[PDB]
Design a protein around this ligand. Structure first.
Ligand SMILES: Nc1ncnc2c1ncn2[C@@H]1O[C@H](CO)[C@@H](O)[C@H]1O
Ligand SMILES: [Cl-]
Ligand SMILES: [Zn+2]
Ligand SMILES: [Zn+2]
Lengths: 116, 300
């Protein structure tokens, strides 16, 4: 398939053009005293984050399209994703645009302190 | 009252013992809305309070626990209730959910279709249903016991709920079934639980705690629903979101409850006593296999 829809680029371009972020991401009630890691088996928001059900924050899940992983696996479905409170207006955009540190499990740039 | 700091209110036992006639439900606080924490959906708040209440019962919580959740989709295309159940349940709990309409879910597996199409090889430790048809809320017509998905739920419980297991099935003034109330008498204990965030509604969760597979009590479900409505009609419940703000003890404790496979002849009074205390589950510990029947038609 030389042709494949690039949903990620479409959403980024849509946001940059002033489009409204995807809504109805499922925010969880929690203590907000968790580890702050990015993607966890139960909500782990710290005081600076909100925790969301993972599937509802996944662009591919929400758009009903194939995941880019060759086996179609989803990093978020069945887990909880922690989103900085300052970015919680657009959890899908946040998870799409950012990366988890493979070492400490925090978001690169939003918790990871490994370059230190 | 002090009820406002609870997750909700369970039917007081004395109301269960009445012989009321069925009346229209007229709630004092109807149309009031609770103030939910910023950005929190009603269905997350509601399931959170339900789970907070279930934490107070003698649920069996085995290793390799199996839970099935009917009516899990929303008009939003997501599954907020499933997200709360998976937060509540021990990590690794097998969670299956289902709905008539398509939705995306955090459950381990999701089946889309009428619940009547759903079959499972295995038994379950907990059954949750939020299935509801708002077309039942017809105040101009008689309020009779409903069939439809309630007929499926009654059979599903009797065929596929492990002994010792529990259920929470959503009902309303008009969405109810007499046999389902009668089946509550096949559990060691039961109630009708109203969440404090949705106390302005005639909704409740009918909860059966520790299934015994046989009647412990003979319940007339037409009378029991009348008793439930009488309770709601005479006991205004203050809308409250207070319990949502303390999540420290929310997770369901992994009790490691024992699972045994037993044939009906071996279920003696001792076994029945263990089942009744939340200390035993009886079912196979095989693989979890589910399916949905699909009707095939060629329209050409
Ligand atoms: N017979 C049914 N089978 C499956 N889901 C149902 C059924 N009736 C209602 N629901 C679901 O119950 C939820 C509550 O209205 C809705 O998501 C609706 O699709
Ligand atoms: Cl009765
Ligand atoms: Zn996904
Ligand atoms: Zn790191």
């Amino acid at each position: 398939c030389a042709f494949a829809v690039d949903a990620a680029k479409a959403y980024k371009d849509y946001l940059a053009s002033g489009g409204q972020p995807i809504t109805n991401c499922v925010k969880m009630l929690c203590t907000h005293t968790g580890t702050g890691q990015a993607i966890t088996v139960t909500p782990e928001a710290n005081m600076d984050q909100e925790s969301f059900g993972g599937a509802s924050c996944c662009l591919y899940c929400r758009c009903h399209i194939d995941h880019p992983n060759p086996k179609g696996f989803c990093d978020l479905k069945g887990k909880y994703v922690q989103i900085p409170t300052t970015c919680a207006n657009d959890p899908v955009g946040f998870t799409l645009k950012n990366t988890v540190c493979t070492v400490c499990g925090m978001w690169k740039g939003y918790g990871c302190s490994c370059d230190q | 009252s002090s009820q406002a700091w609870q997750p909700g209110v369970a039917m007081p036992n004395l109301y269960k013992m009445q012989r009321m006639l069925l009346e229209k439900c007229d709630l004092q606080n109807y149309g009031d809305s609770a103030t939910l924490p910023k950005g929190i959906m009603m269905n997350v708040a509601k399931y959170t309070q339900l789970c907070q209440y279930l934490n107070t019962l003698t649920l069996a919580v085995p290793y390799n626990m199996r839970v099935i959740h009917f009516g899990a989709g929303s008009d939003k295309g997501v599954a907020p209730g499933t997200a709360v159940l998976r937060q509540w349940l021990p990590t690794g709990t097998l969670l299956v959910d289902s709905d008539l309409n398509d939705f995306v879910s955090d459950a381990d597996s999701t089946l889309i279709g009428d619940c009547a199409t759903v079959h499972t090889a295995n038994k379950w430790d907990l059954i949750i249903s939020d299935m509801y048809d708002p077309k039942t809320k017809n105040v101009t017509k008689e309020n009779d016991s409903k069939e439809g998905f309630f007929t499926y739920i009654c059979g599903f419980i009797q065929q596929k709920l492990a002994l010792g297991g529990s259920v929470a099935i959503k009902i309303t003034e008009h969405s109810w079934n007499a046999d389902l109330y009668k089946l509550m008498g096949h559990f060691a204990w039961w109630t009708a639980f109203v969440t404090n965030v949705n106390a302005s509604s005639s909704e409740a969760f009918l909860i059966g705690c520790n299934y015994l597979g046989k009647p412990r009590e003979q319940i007339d479900g037409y009378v029991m629903h009348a008793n439930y409505i009488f309770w709601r009609n005479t006991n205004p419940i203050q809308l409250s979101s207070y319990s949502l703000f303390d999540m420290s003890k929310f997770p369901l404790k992994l009790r490691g409850t024992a699972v045994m496979s037993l044939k009906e002849g071996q279920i003696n009074d001792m076994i029945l006593s263990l089942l009744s205390k939340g200390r035993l589950i009886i079912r196979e510990n095989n693989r979890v296999v589910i399916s949905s029947d699909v009707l095939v038609n060629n329209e050409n």
